[PDB]
Design a protein around this ligand. Structure first.
Ligand SMILES: *[C@@H]1O[C@H](CO[C@H]2O[C@@H](C)[C@@H](O)[C@@H](O)[C@@H]2O)[C@@H](O[C@@H]2O[C@H](CO)[C@@H](O[C@@H]3O[C@H](CO[C@H]4O[C@H](CO)[C@@H](O)[C@H](O)[C@@H]4O[C@@H]4O[C@H](CO)[C@@H](O)[C@H](O)[C@H]4NC(C)=O)[C@@H](O)[C@H](O[C@H]4O[C@H](CO)[C@@H](O)[C@H](O)[C@@H]4O)[C@@H]3O)[C@H](O)[C@H]2NC(C)=O)[C@H](O)[C@H]1NC(C)=O
Ligand SMILES: [Cl-]
Length: 207
């Protein structure tokens, strides 16, 4: 029968007030016999009525996928409100409920440091600029490298790692042509996290 998956907003969308965070309720294996699907949404038990249900989407295996998207208030998500999707369908003996919310725990402010390439790496044609982000909680975070107000195309960020004090850390490594570093171009590591002032900080690094 029908099955439901409930997906959280992207951290960056919850952290930047200009962006639009969404909770997404997805129903799959909706049958042709009982194709109609009702979604009820609740926020800490109180029904809300602003969800947009997308049109049914027919799969290659003769079932439908039906999606309801609930726009959330950034502050509600960050204040730990519970989002419940209730999915009714005539093939279900009772409606399916799923609930989600933000990871729990006292927030802790990330410390953000940029580290230049080792002198030993300067023998190479590409070099590594390092962004250390440590002491944060919970693990929900976004970390991005930019130059001239635009994202860099060769960086990779480690997952959050539990540190010995129960906070998280990660590193993001930016690789650039050595000549760009030598020319004095400025590179910036932007970090978004709920325990930062304005949910944002940026640290820059140049030769
Ligand atoms: C008939 O076909 C259906 C359509 O899918 C297939 O189409 C065919 C034509 C091929 O193209 C094939 O490749 C496709 O798979 C089948 O639908 C599938 O059903 C299964 C079983 O119900 C679903 O499994 C769930 O998967 C969840 C994760 O889903 C996300 O990630 C997937 C990639 O890893 C991706 O495919 C999904 O679309 C979805 O993507 C996420 O979308 C959200 C919302 O839009 C977005 O915000 C995210 O960024 C995005 N994330 C990522 C990483 O891409 C699991 O979480 C889920 O498990 C949860 O619920 C369980 C209980 O329900 C529970 O046990 C778990 O613990 C957990 O809570 C579950 O495993 C699968 O998603 C679904 N595929 C799609 C595309 O919807 C169908 O099964 C099949 N039916 C039959 C009878 O044959
Ligand atoms: Cl913003």
């Amino acid at each position: 029968g029908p099955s439901v998956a409930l997906f959280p907003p992207k951290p960056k969308d919850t952290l930047m007030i200009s962006r639009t965070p969404e909770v997404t309720c997805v129903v799959v294996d909706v049958s042709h016999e009982d194709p109609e699907v009702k979604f009820n949404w609740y926020v800490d038990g109180v029904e809300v009525h602003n969800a947009k249900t997308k049109p049914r989407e027919e799969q290659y295996n003769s079932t439908y996928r039906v999606v309801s998207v609930l726009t959330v208030l950034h502050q509600d998500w960050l204040n730990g409100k519970e989002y419940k999707c209730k999915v009714s369908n005539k093939a279900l003996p009772a409606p399916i409920e799923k609930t989600i919310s933000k990871a729990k725990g006292q927030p802790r402010e990330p410390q953000v440091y940029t580290l230049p390439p080792s002198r030993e790496e300067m023998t190479k044609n590409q070099v590594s600029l390092t962004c250390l982000v440590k002491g944060f909680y919970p693990s929900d975070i976004a970390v991005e490298w930019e130059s001239n107000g635009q994202p860099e195309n060769n960086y990779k960020t480690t997952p959050p790692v539990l540190d010995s004090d129960g906070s998280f850390f990660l590193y993001s490594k930016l690789t650039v042509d050595k000549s760009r570093w030598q020319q004095g171009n400025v590179f910036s590591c932007s970090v978004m996290h709920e325990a930062l002032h304005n949910h944002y900080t940026q640290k820059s690094l140049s030769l």
